[PDB]
Design a protein around this ligand. Structure first.
Ligand SMILES: Nc1ncnc2c1ncn2[C@@H]1O[C@H](COP(=O)(O)OP(=O)(O)O)[C@@H](O)[C@H]1O
Ligand SMILES: [Zn+2]
Length: 154
C-alpha cells in the first residue's frame, strides 16, 4: 500500500463539508481496539454520501471546538438489508473524554481505499494504522493542510 494518496492539490469532489451529531455505534466498540470511532447521525449522510464509494476517507473534523486530522469509514448499517449509509470518524491523536451528542463538523479531503476483506483483528489494526499514516502524509501538503483553518471550523 502507498504511504500517500491523492493529487498534490485538493480536487473535486473534495472538499466535502458536512456536520452531524455523534451517536452510539452498532455495538462492537473500536475503543477496545485502541482506535475509537465516532458514528455520525444517519440523517446527516444519507443523501450526501449515497453515491460516494464505500471505504476509508481522510480529512479534518472538529468537535468540542477542537480540530483534528481524521480518517472516516463509509459503509452501510449492518442491521438493515436496505442500503442505509453509515459514517464513522476517528479523530487522529486526540486526547479527551467521549463526546456523544456533540455536533461534529467534517471536511473530507480525499479517498484512501475501499473496504478490505476482513482478514483478522491483527490485519485490521495494521490497516487502520496505515490509514492514519497515509492520512497524515497526504495532509502534510499545503493545499490540504490549509483546510485545518477552513471557515467551516469557525
Ligand atoms: N479520537 C477519537 N475519535 C473518535 N471517537 C473518539 C475519540 N476519542 C474518544 N472517542 C469517543 O469514542 C466513542 C466511540 O467508542 P466505541 O467504543 O467505538 O463505541 P461505539 O461502538 O458506540 O462507537 C465516540 O462516540 C467518542 O465519543
Ligand atoms: Zn465506533
Amino acid at each position: 500500500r502507498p504511504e500517500i494518496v491523492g493529487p498534490e492539490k485538493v480536487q473535486s469532489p473534495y472538499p466535502i463539508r458536512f456536520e452531524g451529531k455523534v451517536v452510539h455505534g452498532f455495538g462492537r466498540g473500536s475503543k477496545e481496539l485502541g482506535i475509537p470511532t465516532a458514528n455520525i447521525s444517519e440523517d446527516a449522510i444519507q443523501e450526501l454520501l449515497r453515491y460516494r464509494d464505500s471505504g476509508v476517507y481522510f480529512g479534518y473534523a472538529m468537535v468540542q471546538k477542537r480540530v483534528f486530522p481524521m480518517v472516516m469509514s463509509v459503509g452501510w448499517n449492518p442491521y438493515y438489508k436496505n442500503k442505509l449509509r453509515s459514517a464513522e470518524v476517528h479523530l487522529i491523536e486526540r486526547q479527551g473524554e467521549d463526546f456523544y451528542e456533540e455536533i461534529m463538523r467534517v471536511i473530507v479531503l480525499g479517498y484512501i481505499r475501499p473496504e478490505l476483506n476482513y482478514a483478522g483483528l491483527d490485519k485490521l489494526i495494521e490497516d487502520i494504522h496505515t490509514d492514519i499514516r497515509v492520512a497524515l502524509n497526504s495532509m502534510d501538503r499545503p493545499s490540504y493542510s490549509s483546510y485545518k483553518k477552513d471557515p467551516f471550523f469557525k
